[PDB]
Design an enzyme around this catalytic site. Structure first.
Site, PDB file in Angstrom:
ATOM      1  N   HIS A  93       0.600  -1.222   0.023  1.00 40.42           N
ATOM      2  CA  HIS A  93       0.248  -0.028  -0.038  1.00 40.42           C
ATOM      3  C   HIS A  93       0.686   1.180  -0.124  1.00 40.42           C
ATOM      4  O   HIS A  93       1.961   1.369   0.165  1.00 40.42           O
ATOM      5  CB  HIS A  93      -0.950  -0.009   1.191  1.00 40.42           C
ATOM      6  CG  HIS A  93      -0.257   0.524   2.403  1.00 40.42           C
ATOM      7  ND1 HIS A  93      -0.501   1.651   2.918  1.00 40.42           N
ATOM      8  CD2 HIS A  93       0.075  -0.326   3.328  1.00 40.42           C
ATOM      9  CE1 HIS A  93       0.038   1.761   4.074  1.00 40.42           C
ATOM     10  NE2 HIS A  93       0.211   0.638   4.633  1.00 40.42           N
ATOM     11  N   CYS A  94       0.364   2.264  -0.446  1.00 40.92           N
ATOM     12  CA  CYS A  94       0.787   3.700  -0.456  1.00 40.92           C
ATOM     13  C   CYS A  94      -0.237   4.585   0.282  1.00 40.92           C
ATOM     14  O   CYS A  94      -0.813   4.201   1.250  1.00 40.92           O
ATOM     15  CB  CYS A  94       1.229   3.981  -1.900  1.00 40.92           C
ATOM     16  SG  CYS A  94       0.100   3.916  -3.305  1.00 40.92           S
ATOM     17  N   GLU A  95      -0.060   5.830  -0.035  1.00 42.06           N
ATOM     18  CA  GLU A  95      -1.075   6.660   0.495  1.00 42.06           C
ATOM     19  C   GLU A  95      -2.538   6.611  -0.019  1.00 42.06           C
ATOM     20  O   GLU A  95      -3.207   6.621   0.812  1.00 42.06           O
ATOM     21  CB  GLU A  95      -0.675   8.479   0.105  1.00 42.06           C
ATOM     22  CG  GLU A  95      -1.403   9.271   0.991  1.00 42.06           C
ATOM     23  CD  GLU A  95      -1.013  10.781   0.493  1.00 42.06           C
ATOM     24  OE1 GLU A  95       0.220  10.881  -0.207  1.00 42.06           O
ATOM     25  OE2 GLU A  95      -1.584  11.608   1.132  1.00 42.06           O
TER      26      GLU A  95
END
Ligand SMILES: [Cl-]
Length: 171
Positions: A93-95
């Site tokens: 995951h990222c932002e």
């Protein structure tokens, strides 16, 4: 639905629609189901790979998440001494719905295929957390450490974004 990367069994978790049609996405509720041990009898170990830059991670991350934004660090932590088992699952995951999480997911698969004989894999089951940290935090803040959210484009962290981008393999 298709089998996992090594074609041994089905994907365990329920999926949701995401930007990348060829990747498997999970909801914040499914991530909590994993963290709460609802799949403890089937899942031996799982790693939440936070693909964000250090400042974003330090300002608030999912509990037990490992910060691996650089490809070489992700390959070192995951593939030099593989987490062997039951199932082993990876969640990237990222932002929000950016490219950092999906790009790392594809990279780990490329390297996993390269160090193995087809179709055996060390990490056959990999997912992306839909909405990243931006959607996870307002839903489950007590599953986060610290209880805060620091965006990538935060005003006081413009130099930190720049300094870190210069450490990446490609841009
Ligand atoms: Cl990199």
């Amino acid at each position: 639905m298709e089998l996992i990367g090594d074609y041994s069994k089905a994907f365990l978790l329920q999926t949701v629609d995401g930007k990348h049609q060829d990747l498997k996405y999970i909801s914040p509720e499914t991530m909590v189901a994993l963290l709460t041990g609802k799949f403890s009898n089937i899942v031996d170990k799982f790693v939440i790979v936070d693909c964000r830059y250090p400042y974003e991670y330090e300002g608030g991350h999912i509990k037990t998440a490992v910060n691996l934004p650089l490809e070489r660090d992700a390959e070192s932590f995951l593939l030099k001494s593989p987490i062997a088992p039951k199932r082993v699952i990876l969640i990237f995951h990222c932002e929000f719905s950016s490219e950092r999480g999906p790009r790392m997911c594809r990279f780990i698969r490329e390297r996993d295929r390269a160090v193995n004989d087809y179709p055996s894999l060390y990490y056959p089951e990999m997912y992306i957390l839909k909405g990243g940290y931006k959607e996870f935090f307002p839903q489950h803040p007590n599953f986060c450490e610290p209880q805060d959210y620091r965006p990538m484009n935060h005003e006081a962290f413009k130099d930190e974004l720049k300094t870190f981008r210069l450490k990446t393999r490609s841009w």
